[model samples]
Target chain A: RREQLMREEAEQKRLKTVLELQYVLDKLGDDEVRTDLKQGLNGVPILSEEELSLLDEFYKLVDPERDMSLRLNEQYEHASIHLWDLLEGKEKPVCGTTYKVLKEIVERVFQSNYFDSTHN
Target chain B: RREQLMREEAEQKRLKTVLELQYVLDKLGDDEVRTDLKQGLNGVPILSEEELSLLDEFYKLVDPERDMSLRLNEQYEHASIHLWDLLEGKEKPVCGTTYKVLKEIVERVFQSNYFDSTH
Candidate 1:
């Protein structure tokens, strides 16, 4: 019973750490930070060459107009769906409220970076 | 070899039929049509008692304000993702163009049913 409890506690701690790292990566818009976080989590380079190539192809298909807001919106939608999948299963708390946070963050990113006409 | 070929042909035929039926179901708008299509495909009564009960639960959760357009929009979005899963990775044409069709259909449903005040 003690061994079982300790294993469960360790698993929970790992899950919590992963979740927090995901949250931090989501907040940090820097590509370098995202790469580092992803590498730390996956134990490999953050964006593999193949993954970056696929992303380039994906961008060509989706970002024809080169609108940063559009690109970020697409990312936000994809992340929202992934997060939904993560939260929906039985083992974790279903924080549906996180969707609202994602929405706000996407909007903030768009407003701060893409819609700041004063810089242009 | 002949028997194996026949089995492969039959399997392909069945898959094609299922895909076509799913396409027709996607294009259909009426609840009755959806019910019939679902029943025909699933080999059970369309919208079975249990399924309806669960749908009722889902509707209550999603349609709190009873806004029909919002409900349909949500359903469209869910269907879009399911269709994406169906199309991606081998066995069928990805046809990402289907997303455009879904978007147009959802917009039309909203405009015709909810936005038009002429009713």
Candidate 2:
């Protein structure tokens, strides 16, 4: 049972991180911004091809270059399964580390002035 | 042109708020906490009609009982349509008020200690 609870704690942690990462990733796709991105993409074509290559290396982890919305619904579905019926003792952690990271970011954002907050 | 700009500003504001609200609503569903939420729901099944009525009124705004994930993806889809090709002048707001509200919440969350940071 001790080992079992530890496994549950780890699973919860993984699931929570996936949930939070999925949450953070959700901010893409603004019509105006998308138009801007497309325009930017078309207008400039590619940025320092080296830079884009760096970004794409990581981008494909969640989705295809064609489109998958990167860790969106599909990944969300994958993460949510580990969430059900998981048990944790008081000593164990509940959510994944990424989730905690988000909370901290939120706390930082929470303390910020509106002008400092721009997510368009 | 003033009227056209005004429309564009509002559209931009709406788009920004959609982006932000969608950001905040992302916190639900954890394996441990979900079990807790479900057990909380199951153990009690239904809370007082008054309380549940209160909760469901707002809950359904995002998802259907049949399961649409609420304003999760579909609404995000619906809102994204309003976001493109919209423009605003300098005097106009870029995001809806809700985005600012979320910003405030994020700022507050940002300042909080981890213990309080539990989502």
Candidate 3:
């Protein structure tokens, strides 16, 4: 009876594991990331815990699904504006970087020999 | 009655145009491009042809709709790889830059003072 019960429990656990894996697979569709993942899997069903964590790192870095560059330009302009605003001490941005400290940093950088308008 | 008919016609045209525009607007959901477009329209009904075309130019420059830079790195890598392949003159690349021309260019450039291997 105990042997049968153990087998049934193991079967149920296997079913649960497959279901979870299917959920992750379903979320993954045609994209650069999915392709990369499929390649990485490469007939290996079980990955080490380390590799699984590293895969998460890769996703955060590249996100093969979404184009990272589209927002890059917008961010450039936003950064420039925020930096300017901070330097002027005229406005407060989202990060709560104190305008006073930013103004000082900007002044220091601009004043430093490292930042020459002519050299650039 | 003539004025009313003209007004109705304009209204119908407006609906048709807005519907078409809405199709485009519907495709554009999020990201920076949509935000910039809103800023461009800024309560104005219709922009001039020049500005409208320029807006398209701006979009191509910066698709408030999509990010341009993410693909930028991909293209850079592709370009470098293709350029190296062309220099070798062995692999036929996408543009069909002939091995004959490329090999000559590569050899000449490498031989030239402009491309001194040591310097």
Candidate 4:
């Protein structure tokens, strides 16, 4: 009976884990950080240690799925603005290799500068 | 005297050509179409024949360096809107591999779809 109870508990926990993962995935779809990270892939999290660590710093300061208004609060402003510039067509630039930071991280990891300005 | 006159006329024409080339270069720096085409370059014209032909169509319809407002005039609207969306991060998207059309052109030329959605 105890073994059956344990199996039942394990099954419930497994179901819970699946639900949690699904929830996270759905939230990720709406997550600005995840969206920005993904700009390179059309979007994913195939990230490096360095990039993941930066994301950790970013995660602490802002809610992943929160709107831009919440970002205006003092604690999150600078980061949001920086992200906003990258998101808008400013520093990151829509025409250049969109999502400039993610692209740079990828280039650094691969050690192949395929997108250099002089590419002709 | 005729030879001298011809030489002087040739020099003037040569100078005019130089000035015109410089003018085009300067205008290219401010050109909306050039800028859109360059979004891939960080900004250049290393383009396919397909792309250059499209630019010819674009060039005939609108002034190269004109601002967005001028793009609103009826004859020029569709192309400008298309170019505008690509420029404004609406279609091109600031985060994705920017200058999507240009990138596609490059990918097509190279025969490698490096920036595919699954990439």
Indicate the residue-level lDDT of B10 in model 2: 42
CA lDDT for candidate 2 = 0.32
Estimate the TM-score for candidate 1: 0.20
Best-to-worst ranking by TM-score: 2, 1, 3, 4
- Report the C-alpha displacement of residue B64, candidate 1, in angstroms: 2.0
Q: Provide the lDDT at A23 for model 3.
A: 26
lDDT of 2 at B32: 46
Per-residue accuracy of model 1 over B15-113 as CA lDDT, tens digit each: 332233232333344566545534633474434444333333333322233233432223234333333323222243223323344334333333332
Worst 10 residues of 3 chain A by lDDT: A111-120
**Which candidate tops DockQ?**
2
Error of 3 at B52 (Å): 1.2
lDDT of 2 by residue, B1-119 (tens): 79756743443343333333333233322344333333443474212333323223323333222223332223233222222211111232323333243234333322322112233
DockQ of 2: 0.02
Model 1: residues with Cα > 4 Å off, grouped in runs? A1-120, B1-33, B66-119
CAPRI band for model 3: incorrect
Chain A (candidate 2) TM-score to true chain A: 0.32
Q: In candidate 2, which residue ranges exceed 4 Å CA deviation?
A: A1-120, B30-119
Predicted structure with the largest lDDT when compared to the true one? 4
Model 3 C-alpha lDDT per residue in residues B15-101, reported as the tens digit of each score? 232222222333334434344433433553222334334334422322222134433222223323333343345645333334454
TM-score of chain A of 1: 0.27
| Model 4 CA deviation exceeding 4 Å by range | A1-45, A61-73, A88-99, A103-120, B1-119
Best candidate per TM-score, number? 2
Name the better of 1 and 4 by TM-score: 1
lDDT of each: 0.35, 0.32, 0.34, 0.36
Per-residue lDDT tens digits for candidate 4, residues B9-101, read 433332232222222333334455354444544433445445645434433433333242331122234333333333233445322234466
